[PDB]
């Protein structure tokens, strides 16, 4: 399965106890447009489009 | 609609997503987390459960099982009584793949009265 | 439980002292 791009709807917060993981709710840019929550590394903001390698895996809500 | 019962053993140590034909005497396919993961602690993991199904689903669709009734269970008996992380993923992986859910039910074995559990009166003084 | 372990040590030593008196008398 090719990776599917998803755009950030809400930047939920900073995790990993070092803040480096960013929690973001991402809505698939194309397709069913499911809104899943995924961990992100680096600088991220609303409307950032990132290719999700599997997308069937989601981080704990707001954790 | 063809229907089977997919017993989901969500437990610590490992998860077994196993589909049987109503009566439970015959199995239309069985998969476990440890069959999809190499690390012992990752056997009770959502990823292994999502990998184990979608591999199970392929076997059961070949065998013509369009829909399944879920009967999720915990370790139960004298211990646990709560589902492992893999148990949620297995139902989600069945829903996504196109298996139509019928009746979801709690099959945890629960004691009317129990035999002394393991651990001692002082307990697991880890 | 040092106080309970103290009475376990004491009982063990009084048992031994009884054995020595049993060897004599």
């Amino acid at each position: 399965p090719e990776p599917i791009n998803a755009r950030v709807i809400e930047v939920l917060g900073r995790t990993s106890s070092r803040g480096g993981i960013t929690q973001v709710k991402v809505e698939f840019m194309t397709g069913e447009k499911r809104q899943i929550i995924r961990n992100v590394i680096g600088p991220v903001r609303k409307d950032d489009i990132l290719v999700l390698m599997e997308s069937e895996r989601e981080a704990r809500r707001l954790r | 609609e063809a229907f089977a019962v997919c017993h989901i053993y969500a437990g610590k140590n490992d998860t077994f997503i196993h589909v049987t034909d109503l009566s439970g005497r015959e199995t239309i396919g069985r998969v476990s987390g440890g069959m999809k993961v190499k690390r012992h602690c990752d056997e009770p993991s959502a990823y292994a459960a999502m990998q184990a199904t979608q591999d199970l689903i392929e076997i059961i669709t070949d065998r013509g099982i369009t829909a399944v009734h879920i009967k999720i269970r915990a370790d139960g008996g004298t211990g646990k009584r709560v589902y492992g992380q893999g148990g949620s993923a297995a139902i989600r992986a069945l829903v996504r793949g196109g298996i139509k859910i019928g009746r979801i039910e709690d099959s945890t074995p629960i004691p009317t009265d129990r035999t002394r559990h393991k651990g001692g009166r002082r307990g697991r003084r880890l | 439980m040092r106080a309970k372990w103290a009475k376990k040590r004491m009982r063990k030593l009084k048992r031994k002292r009884r054995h020595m008196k049993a060897r004599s008398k």
């Binding site: 989601e58 809500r61 | 609609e1 829909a67 999720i72 211990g79 009584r81 709560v82 949620s88 139902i91 989600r92 069945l94 829903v95 996504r96 298996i99 139509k100 859910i101 019928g102 009746r103 979801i104 039910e105 709690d106 559990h117 393991k118 651990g119 001692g120 009166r121 002082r122 307990g123 697991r124 | -």
Partner: protein
């Protein structure tokens, strides 16, 4: 000195109560000195709840609720934060938080 009047257990008009096992630590605690928290969670995760309903062929199906009573020992509860060390005045407050 005596930290609590109840002595840490609700034993009134009693010389002996039943023995419960802490679920996490598997220890033996009296019924009076036990956490006893009853939880009704839906069988599935709330993230996967709506998609289970869409997938479910049965019309008018209601998602099963899981009813369980989690009982823990003081050590196997303070460490999981089910109960918290309170201030001497706050300790007296018997009302459940929220």
């Amino acid at each position: 000195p005596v930290k609590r009047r109840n002595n840490g257990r609700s034993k009134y008009n009693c010389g002996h109560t039943n023995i419960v096992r802490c679920q996490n630590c598997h220890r033996c605690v009296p019924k009076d000195k036990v956490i006893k928290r009853f939880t009704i969670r839906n069988i599935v995760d709330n993230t996967i709840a709506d998609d289970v309903l869409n997938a479910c062929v049965i019309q008018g199906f209601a998602i099963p609720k899981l009813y369980n009573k989690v009982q823990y020992c003081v050590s196997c509860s303070i460490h999981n934060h089910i109960v918290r060390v309170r201030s001497r005045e706050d300790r007296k407050i018997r009302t459940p938080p929220k």
